[PDB]
RNA sequence: UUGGCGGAAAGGCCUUGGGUGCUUGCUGGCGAAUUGCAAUGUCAUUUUGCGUGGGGAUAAAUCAUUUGUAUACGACUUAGA
RNA sequence: GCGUUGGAUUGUUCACCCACUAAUAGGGAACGUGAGCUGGGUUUAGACCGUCGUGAGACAGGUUAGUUUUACCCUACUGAU
RNA sequence: CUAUCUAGCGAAACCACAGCCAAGGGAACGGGCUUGGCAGAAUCAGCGGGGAAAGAAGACCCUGUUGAGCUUGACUCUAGU
RNA sequence: AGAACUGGUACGGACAAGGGGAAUCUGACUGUCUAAUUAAAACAUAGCAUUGCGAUGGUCAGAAAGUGAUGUUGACGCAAU
RNA sequence: GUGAACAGCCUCUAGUUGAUAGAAUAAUGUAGAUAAGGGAAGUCGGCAAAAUAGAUCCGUAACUUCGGGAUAAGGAUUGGC
RNA sequence: GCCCUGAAAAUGGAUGGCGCUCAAGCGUGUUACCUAUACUCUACCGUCAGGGUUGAUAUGAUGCCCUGACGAGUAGGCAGGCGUGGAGGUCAGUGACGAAGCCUAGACCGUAAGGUCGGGUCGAACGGCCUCUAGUGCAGAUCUUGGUGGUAGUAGCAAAUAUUCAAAUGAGAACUUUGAAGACUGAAGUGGGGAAAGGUUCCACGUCAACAGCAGUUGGACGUGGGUUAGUCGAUCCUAAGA
RNA sequence: AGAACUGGCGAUGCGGGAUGAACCGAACGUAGAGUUAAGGUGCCGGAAUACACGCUCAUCAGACACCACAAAAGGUGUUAG
RNA sequence: GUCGAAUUUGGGUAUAGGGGCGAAAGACUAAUCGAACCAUCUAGUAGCUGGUUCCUGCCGAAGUUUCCCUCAGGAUAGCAG
RNA sequence: AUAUUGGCGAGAGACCGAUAGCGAACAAGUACAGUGAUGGAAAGAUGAAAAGAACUUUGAAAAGAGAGUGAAAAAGUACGUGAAAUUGUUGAAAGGGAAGGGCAUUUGAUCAGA
């Protein structure tokens, strides 16, 4: 365990994580922030729509010179994308968390994504070859993803 | 050091910024000065540019080399079905300019103009003006009170009119709504004219007449992002130029250490609002009048529409205004024709033009025949027909 | 409550009639203390939330699809029970 | 305010002439402007000549050949959300 | 075919801190200082004015009691003869 | 090689494939070089001329040698210009 | 096969279908083209491009070291049957 | 005297700005007022100087105390101190009931170098004082090594004509396999063999974490194995320039 | 660009000269109060839109030394001799 | 440009650093050439550039004299502790 | 009797404590580079003991969630502690062309002493 800072009830919580996942850390952070706080079923439907290009993931921090689309309007932004790999990883982790909630006996209808955090995994290093016999790094930026879904209560 | 060879600057700095117009309908920013002895009349009209054709007419210009001779001239056709008056707006004057005090709408509005108040008409409940129409419940006391306010105030009176876009061949189906100033005396009678014309059509022949100079206000054809060479007419750089030649070589001196607003830059070309003045009306023709394209010299019973229809527009079925030359905007675009803001007496205006012949050959190619009957007579019998 | 006036940003001004409260215009009766020798010694207006009563109304926009009078992408301009 | 040119020779600035013109005014902006160009000249290395030097070599003397790199950042500007 | 938008992949140069101007004075050409002008989130495509932009401890010039290539009856020597 | 006929007078129908002329400077020519900014008029060249040398020799090597290149050579040669 | 041809172009045997892709079609680019009238006025300079081009027949100047120049220049013809 | 003409330069701009006209301008005179780290008084810190006080409990005579004046500072000198690794002594010092280290807009002491404490983490050593010793204190040196950013999900992954449909496999197919189609190399080949070089890349099976700058079930990848058979082909022998 | 005497800046903060190494004032331990220096007191901006006598009207007024410029020559402008 | 002979080229071989090789450019001699590469002398020397690590307290300068193959340095006296 | 950075065997240190100390605490003159002469690294630490996570569930799988071992998993072989740069989430606050600082106080949060 030892997730990031959470303030929810562990007994009404279910966790899931994936480490050293070879997916863009920036895209995955945007994808996670897109569903942070959402109900679990709503977030899963939204991620499916994103995969289908019906809705977009709004890029808020890692968004310089990316591109503009009308699908960011519902989030009040102009810069949004469809990071399919990040969505696949995040929804696999969401399915795992839903399975863990079911094993714990938690009400699936009351589940919402109470915590989701993506941070940088150690880089996987490759080399690209440059003009005049130069060699530059060609590294990946993989992600550690974690999330916990909790029952909505009062 | 100095420029070393003088040249006029490229482009006009008074048409800045070369940005997209905020609306596809160009605003009328000035109406003719009000003469309050004339009867109440619209100062402008709304039409749709259909296309151009050519005419032949005898030139009346004493002292000219072509006096009493035949000149071929280009003309623009604007499909102008009658506009429906659906409201009146009162304008009071303030130390901060003109200000709309109140607007009084007609009791019944057509679906054409109702669509203008809707982004999604197909899935809406069409509730627009449903409660407003209740102000005409028994005697229209609220409507009369608002009209009384407009009479008591509102040194400027404009009518709200909308096009009958359904009478045009356009697929838009959404009417264009605009304010037209009411010139003529007695703001009280301006309001009376507007109220009496609520829900009623006004034809272009009641606003404009033959030989009249008018102004065309329209958004020009759009061309997207354009380089300096065509956006501003700058000189093409030599073929030897590295990094491209369709550019401006020096976009500024070292000081001021900034690119200046006056330097030609690449950007949006076209889709600009333009008000072009002094276009002479060559015809005020009527759709219900067959032989629209006929003259007293031709007598061939034909409409203004070219063979095969106006290219990308269709057939003219309504009243139409034929103006000399060309006007801003492309075919199918809404244009506003307004009366001239001054009294031009230059023998170019005040010239009475009588068309001898209007071209109705196909504009979809090198049209050879004015009418299908003429094509029949020239070609003889064909295999399919004739 | 009667009526009128006010459009420059009127949102206020004037006025009619009655009801009811106060009146320090004048003359009385009772009360005040202990906040302790002062402590702003809390009296204004500015938004919002929520509850309780009463009145009122019963939409759109965006995405997706479509159009090309538009257009790098956004945007624009069209259509669709 | 508005315009102030087209050319022959010359890398040329300068000059000079032809010609048109209303006029062919003078200048600045890091002697504006090379990640705008070009590279004819000056001003690397090759080579030739003249003069000079014993020589290696010198020459505001002449001649010929001689790689013109990068913007995706910020601002400015042009357009666009 | 790019550029452009998307999926995936994903560097580098550069970086005191940074980034709107006018004038002043100032190491005599400010992004910062002084006085004014002003100044509203987050941005996209271009762009080549500026960042006295980047690239390299100037290669021209001078200094050094720092060299090296080359030349000569410079000084002092030397293989050979 | 020729003749007739034929066609929107097309026809080396795509492909493939010299622009030419009057001159000047310069190097005779073919050839060669600064690989990675100079292909040139620079270098070489045939031709011409000069020089040394008859071998216990000329020219040139080697630290030295009972050592070498020219020389498996001999002036129509070798060596140096 | 065409064609003088191991040229260019198409095909047989054999081999490959490997270069990150999808959507749009702005500017500016890279590569490839066209262009009315004029025809080097552009430019340091015809740079770049265009023009010419194969074959057959005719015709071919100055100059020349008599060998060339020379495809000189300049013309005509070309398919199919 | 004041004012005006004389009095023309380049981004828009400067009595500092606004603005000011019996001035908020100019000349002059009289007051009042504003405020420097200056002056006056006081307190406190330090320094320097001159003194008092071993007459005891009274352990701090380098101490305590009295008096007066003074305090800017680069280069630089000197002095008193703070901190680090190790050493002799001592506190019969701290400590698995938690040493050291580390984190801590929590507290306390010092002018400061720093010191101390609380909390969290942690796991095995460490500290105060008197002295001794030095490889003893970093912001720089285009410093060294390592690590990490903004740039930036950006530049870009655009030469070599070109791919498409279906099925199979597979969790997953633009890229694997089969079939169908469309194309190309067009015999001076994108064909079939070799020399040099490489060294197992050959082939089969399994197999996809990494590599194949997308992908991948595929591979010159990964894991395990199989495979190169000579009297006649070469080397071996000969001599070449030469060693 | 070079000397003389002194005072300064370098090495120096502080108040004033908007701004500035050097000018004016004043040199600096930490604070409190008072008074001042130079400079100021319409507003920025702390402090009299103070008092008093005059002068000046500028279609480029003028507005505090260093200091950020102006001359000869002129004017029934106006003022005083 | 050249393309049948001063042709192109494989392998073998020879020439090795003040040496080679050069149809000659100081060209080439393993991305190194106006003297290759490798190791050592070597931590070469530098009057020249850069950096030079804790606090507080007190005092606190010089750019001047003379001499120097001296003028970016030093000795000397002066200023300072 | 004198010398001895080589070899062999020993005993020591006011030496260094993994960027230090030999280049090499470790399969170091190794991997790797160069035609060659030569050049030449990086790289130590779970825990007392693997007791190295049986079993269940989701997933194609890697892994995740549990369960368990252990004194500790805030020791899971990417392993003692685990700083900084840089980063994610959460919380708080501020934000008209930088930000940061000094004096002074308002406000919010937080806290010592009596
Ligand atoms: C003088 O011209 C100096 N810049 C050096 C010239 S050599 C190209
Ligand atoms: K040299
Ligand atoms: Mg941007
Ligand atoms: Mg881009
Ligand atoms: Mg590359
Ligand atoms: Mg390479
Ligand atoms: Mg000019
Ligand atoms: Mg035009
Ligand atoms: Mg070029
Ligand atoms: Mg047409
Ligand atoms: Mg210049
Ligand atoms: Mg420039
Ligand atoms: Mg340049
Ligand atoms: Mg230039
Ligand atoms: Mg040149
Ligand atoms: Mg030269
Ligand atoms: Mg001579
Ligand atoms: Mg400025
Ligand atoms: Mg200045
Ligand atoms: Mg700057
Ligand atoms: Mg300011
Ligand atoms: Mg650019
Ligand atoms: Mg620039
Ligand atoms: Mg230098
Ligand atoms: Mg140098
Ligand atoms: Mg000297
Ligand atoms: Mg020497
Ligand atoms: Mg030649
Ligand atoms: Mg030949
Ligand atoms: Mg040749
Ligand atoms: Mg070369
Ligand atoms: Mg060349
Ligand atoms: Mg020669
Ligand atoms: Mg043949
Ligand atoms: Mg043409
Ligand atoms: Mg033509
Ligand atoms: Mg011609
Ligand atoms: Mg010319
Ligand atoms: Mg010209
Ligand atoms: Mg010329
Ligand atoms: Mg050419
Ligand atoms: Mg000839
Ligand atoms: Mg010919
Ligand atoms: Mg003042
Ligand atoms: Mg005065
Ligand atoms: Mg004493
Ligand atoms: Mg001091
Ligand atoms: Mg030590
Ligand atoms: Mg501890
Ligand atoms: Mg902290
Ligand atoms: Mg332990
Ligand atoms: Mg040290
Ligand atoms: Mg450091
Ligand atoms: Mg330092
Ligand atoms: Mg550094
Ligand atoms: Mg580094
Ligand atoms: Mg990109
Ligand atoms: Mg590319
Ligand atoms: Mg390709
Ligand atoms: Mg296939
Ligand atoms: Mg081909
Ligand atoms: Mg082919
Ligand atoms: Mg294989
Ligand atoms: Mg890949
Ligand atoms: Mg992959
Ligand atoms: Mg294998
Ligand atoms: Mg044999
Ligand atoms: Mg001087
Ligand atoms: Mg100094
Ligand atoms: Mg001073
Ligand atoms: Mg001043
Ligand atoms: Mg004081
Ligand atoms: Mg004040
Ligand atoms: Mg005078
Ligand atoms: Mg030379
Ligand atoms: Mg040293
Ligand atoms: Mg002192
Ligand atoms: Mg001497
Ligand atoms: Mg110096
Ligand atoms: Mg080591
Ligand atoms: Mg470790
Ligand atoms: Mg522990
Ligand atoms: Mg750890
Ligand atoms: Mg951190
Ligand atoms: Mg902004």
Structure write-up:
It is classed as ribosome. Keywords: Eukaryote, translocation. Non-rotated 80S S. cerevisiae ribosome with ligands. Chain A is of the alpha+beta class and 154 residues long. Chain A has 3 helices and 7 strands. Chain A has helices spanning 25-35, 40-51, 84-104, and strands spanning 13-21, 57-58, 80-81, 111-120, 127-130, 134-137, 143-151. In chain A, the strands form 3 sheets. In chain A, strands 1-7-4 form a 3-stranded antiparallel β-sheet. The longest helix of chain A has 21 residues, at 84-104. Chain A is globular and about 65 Å long. Chain B is mostly beta strands. Chain B folds into 2 domains: 16-81 and 203-220 and 270-384, Elongation Factor Tu (Ef-tu), domain 3 (Beta Barrel); 82-202, 2-Layer Sandwich (Ribosomal Protein L3, Chain: B, domain 2). Chain B contains 5 helices and 15 strands. In chain B, the strands form 3 sheets. In chain B, strands 1, 4, 5, 6, 7 and 8 form a 6-stranded antiparallel β-sheet that branches. In chain B, a hairpin with a 2-residue loop joins strand 4 (83-94) and strand 5 (97-105). Classes of the chains: A alpha+beta (154), B mainly beta (386). The chains hardly touch. Bound molecules: methionine (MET), potassium ion (K) and magnesium ion (MG) (83 copies). The site of one magnesium ion has 3 residues of chain B, from loops. The structure holds 9 RNA strands.
Outline:
The structure is cut from a larger assembly and holds chains A (154 residues) and B (386 residues). Chain A has 154 residues and is α+β, with helices and mostly antiparallel strands.
